[PDB]
């Protein structure tokens, strides 16, 4: 039985993920650097399970796109409208 405050915190974390994704250019590997950015945006990653949960909620509701980058095996998340050029540029840059 989820208390309303907890649900509100989930929404706050989703807003943070969204704002950070816009700020960092709309494409990110799901890894420590990203979670650290979300933590710093919110004012401060010993947990991370909690934020990952909300990333997952966002992927499932299609607020974020997600896919495995096959060469590295890392998971990429992206703003759905960012464009494949940007995604590939990011993959190339972080190669």
Residue numbers in the entry: 543 to 586, 589 to 639
What text comes from the article?
The τ138 subunit is currently the least well-characterized subunit of TFIIIC. We first solved the structure of the central domain of τ138 (546–641) using the sulphur-SAD technique. The 1.4 Å crystal structure (Rwork/Rfree of 17.5%/19.8%) of this domain reveals a canonical winged helix domain that contains an additional C-terminal helix. This first structurally characterized part of τ138 thus represents an ‘extended' winged helix (eWH) domain35. The eWH domain is moderately well conserved from yeast to human, and contains basic patches that could also suggest a role in binding nucleic acids. However, we only detect very weak unspecific binding of the eWH domain to single and double-stranded DNA. Isothermal titration calorimetry (ITC) did not detect an interaction between the eWH and the TPR array. However, when we tested a construct that contained the eWH domain with additional residues at the C terminus (546–693), we observed a Kd for the interaction with the TPR array of ∼100 nM. We thus concluded that the region 641–693 of τ138, hereafter referred to as ‘τ131-Interaction Region (τIR)', is necessary and sufficient to bind the TPR array of τ131. Interestingly, the removal of just the eWH domain is also lethal to yeast, indicating that despite it being dispensable for the interaction with τ131 in vitro, it is still essential for proper TFIIIC function in vivo.
Recruitment of Pol III to these genes requires the essential transcription factors TFIIIB and TFIIIC2. The six subunits of yeast TFIIIC are partitioned into two DNA-binding subcomplexes (τA and τB). The binding of these intragenic promoters by TFIIIC permits the assembly of TFIIIB, upstream of the transcription start site, which subsequently leads to the recruitment of Pol III, the formation of a PIC and finally to transcription. A genetic study suggests that the two largest TFIIIC subunits, τ138 and τ131, are responsible for connecting τA and τB16.
